[PDB]
Each structure stands twice: as C-alpha cells, then as structure tokens.
Design a protein around this ligand. Structure first.
Ligand code: NI
Length: 442
C-alpha cells in the first residue's frame, strides 16, 4: 500500500521493513529503467536498417533520427523529476514505462510501410525521447527509498544497470530482426541481397511484452512514499559541460556509431559488434564512480579527459580517405572512446555531488547558518543541480550524431565533426584543471 511511515535512517526501521520494501522497489525500477534506455536509443539500430527495407532517406536524415530523441529526452528530464513527488514512484513508474509501448508499437508498423513520410519518423523519434526522461524520475524515486549512506550504492546500481539498456537493445534488436517471430501479429519480412529475410518490425515490437510485464509489476510491486536558484550558480554551468562531454559523449556515440561505421566502412555489418561499445561504457560508469570514491572525482575526471582527447585524435588516423583502412583500428579506438566516455560519466557525476555539496556547505556557513541547515540545504541544492546537469548532458546525444550528419553532408567526411569533438575535449581538460586548482585540492 501507500507508505505513510517511512523512516529509512532509523536502523531498526530499516531492518524491520524498510530494507525489504526498498529492495523490492529498486529491483523493479532497474528493469523498468533498463527498458527505457532500450526504447530511447531504438533508432541507433533501426536507422541502419531503414534503407534495407526500402526507405530512401539521406544520411543526414538517418543521423537526425538517432539524434532527436535526446532533444525531447533532455527537455523532459526536469519535468519528469518533478512528477515522482506529485504522483508517487509506483504510479509514475508504471505510467512512464507503459506509454513507451506507443512508440514501440507504432515504429513496428511504420517500418513496414515505405510510404510512411519522414515526418512520421520524426514524431516517433521524439516519442522515443520520452524514454530518455525516465532516468530523472527513476533516480529521484530510488533516492527516497534508501538512507543517505546507501543511496550511493543504490543510485549507482539503478543507473548503472539502467544504462546497460542501450547495449542490450543494440544486441537483441539486430538478432530478433532476422527471426520470423511476431508473424501472428503481422510481421512481414523483406528479402535481402544475401537471400536472408529482414523483419525490422521485431526491433521495436520485441520490447512491448517486456514493457507490459514490468508496467504490471510496477503497479503491483512498487510503493508510494508520503514523505530553483541553482541556475544562477556559475559552477552549475561549468559542471554541466563536463557531464555533457562524458555522458553526452556516451549517449551520442551510442546513437551514431553504427550509422557512422556504415558511412566509413559500408562492407562491415556493424550491428553484430556495435553493442559492445555502450556495453563497456555502461560498465565503466560504475568503475568511474568507484575510482572517484577512492581517489577523488576531479583527479579521475581530469586524467579521463586527457584520454578522451588522445583517442579523439587517434580516431583521425583510422579513417579511410574515400579507400582505405582500417576498421579494426577504427573500432578499437571507438571502444576506447566509449570506455572513457562511460568512465568520465561516473567520475564527473561523483565529482559534481562532492564539489557542489561542499561549496554549498561553505556558503551557508559563511552566511552564519547552523550545521543542521547547512547539511540539508546542501542536500537540496545537489539534488537540484544533478537533475539539471543530467538534463543538459543529455543534449550531447543530439549533438554528436547531428554533427556527423552535417559534417558528412557538406564535406563527405566526419573529420569536421571529430575536430569539433577534439577541441571540446581539450577545453574540458583545461576546465577540469581549473576546478582542481581552486575548488578541489583534496
Ligand atoms: Ni569556481
């Protein structure tokens, strides 16, 4: 039922009923969020296979389809974070998971109809973006179920396994598309040059039964708990760039890596390999957080950004001047980018929760605030900041595939976009060096 008496900080309460309830909510939240990341990056897999079905959209148009869900995603993250305390975690989780069936079902029918206008795919693309907003509400919700000591571990597991949703989708979708399942629901195949049949509808339809099962499980298994001037702070905008360069890079490369590989090395079936990128990136986010706890987020973030810049530079030497070579180098460097982008995602996030909380602490104390008020306002501000940072960092998921699409459109080469990425990474190691010299000497 709806919980009125929730005392997670009380050890006796936690041992008695708190831990068991919070364990159940967390472990229904994780699959629900994982599925959100599946639906969010759907077009990273589908847009690769649209020409194979009969669509004649330009390369720039295809990239745009992978880019757009990060727009609505970013925009809706701040509103989504406000929804949980209003409607409760259980109800909003079920609602925000369930509505993802609409673009999943729609896209399945849409890909079988080569008369479907590009405009309709734009709508579906944006609709998939709703899935990208679930992160803000899912994470906000889980924080209330855990004591401040265990939130770090609880939020890390929910977000970590959540981000795994990209890789599992980029693994499963290419596999079920070759399968003749869902025929009873009208799954029609398209004959490919190699003789095999392509069932593109399966790529989105495969999630519908799982979206439904955990929509049901959310309504029956989760609970509701009865229990900003941050924009002005210059540090908020400073940190947002860093999370933009890391999480934005992870989610941006996830959106457009397959599409790019198709434009650089068209022979390689990238879809049987691409998932590994977002896979290690999602694992490195957890690694990045763990390292940051032991050594300090800033130190981890700084070294990571130097690494992002190096591999950003090395990526130029892998590209073909269309002929020729080398894919194996190209993929290796991109794995390194995924890993560092993920690593930096976790490190930056830990860093923001530390730096912003510390400066908030020192501020209210400087105003003559009590220790009690200092701690709680530091909690409000950091929770408010991270939510806003997370929304801004999401826009990188648009920028990178949009930059690849534009660079190729006017030059025929992605190096223009990559050069922009390199400068951004070099700017970031400068930024991160600055905060290491003023705000973080620990
Ligand atoms: Ni400063």
């Amino acid at each position: 039922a709806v919980i009125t008496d929730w005392r997670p900080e009380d050890p006796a309460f936690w041992q008695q009923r708190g831990q068991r309830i919070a364990s159940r909510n967390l472990w229904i939240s994780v699959p629900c969020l994982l599925l959100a990341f599946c639906v969010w990056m759907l077009f990273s897999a589908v847009a690769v296979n649209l020409p194979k079905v009969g669509f004649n959209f330009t390369t720039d148009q295809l990239f745009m389809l992978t880019a757009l869900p990060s727009v609505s995603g970013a925009l809706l993250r701040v509103p989504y974070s406000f929804m949980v305390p209003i409607f409760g975690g259980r109800r909003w989780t079920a609602f925000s998971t369930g509505i993802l069936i609409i673009p999943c079902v729609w896209l399945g029918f849409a890909v079988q109809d080569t008369s479907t206008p590009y405009s309709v795919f734009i709508i579906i693309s944006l609709l998939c973006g709703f899935a990208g907003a679930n992160f803000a509400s899912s994470m906000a919700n889980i924080s209330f179920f855990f004591p401040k000591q265990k939130q770090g571990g609880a939020l890390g597991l929910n977000g970590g396994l959540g981000n795994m949703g990209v890789s599992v989708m980029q693994l499963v979708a290419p596999l079920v598309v070759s399968l003749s399942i869902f025929a009873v629901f009208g799954s029609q195949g398209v004959k490919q040059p190699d003789g095999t049949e392509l069932y593109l509808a399966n790529a989105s339809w495969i999630w519908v039964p799982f979206l439904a099962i955990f929509t049901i499980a959310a309504w029956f298994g989760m609970n509701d708990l009865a229990t900003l001037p941050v924009l002005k702070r210059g540090h908020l905008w400073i940190m947002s760039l860093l999370y933009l360069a890391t999480f934005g890079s992870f989610i941006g490369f996830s959106a457009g890596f397959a599409m790019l590989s198709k434009t650089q090395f068209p022979d390689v079936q990238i879809l049987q390999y691409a998932f590994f990128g977002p896979f290690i990136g999602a694992l490195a986010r957890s690694a990045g957080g763990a390292l940051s706890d032991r050594l300090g987020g800033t130190r981890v973030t700084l070294v990571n950004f130097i690494l992002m810049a190096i591999f950003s530079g090395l990526l130029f030497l892998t590209l073909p001047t269309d002929q020729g070579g080398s894919f194996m180098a190209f993929f290796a460097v991109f794995l390194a980018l995924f890993l560092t982008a993920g690593l930096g995602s976790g490190s930056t996030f830990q860093m923001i929760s530390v730096i912003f909380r510390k400066l908030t602490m020192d501020r209210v104390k400087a105003e003559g605030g009590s220790d009690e008020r200092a701690m709680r306002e530091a909690a409000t501000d950091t929770a408010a900041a991270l939510g806003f940072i997370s929304a801004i960092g999401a826009i990188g998921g648009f920028f990178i595939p949009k930059a690849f699409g534009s660079s190729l459109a006017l030059t025929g080469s992605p190096v223009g976009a990559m050069k922009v990425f390199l400068i951004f990474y070099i700017a970031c190691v400068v930024i991160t060096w600055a905060v290491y010299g003023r705000h973080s000497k620990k």
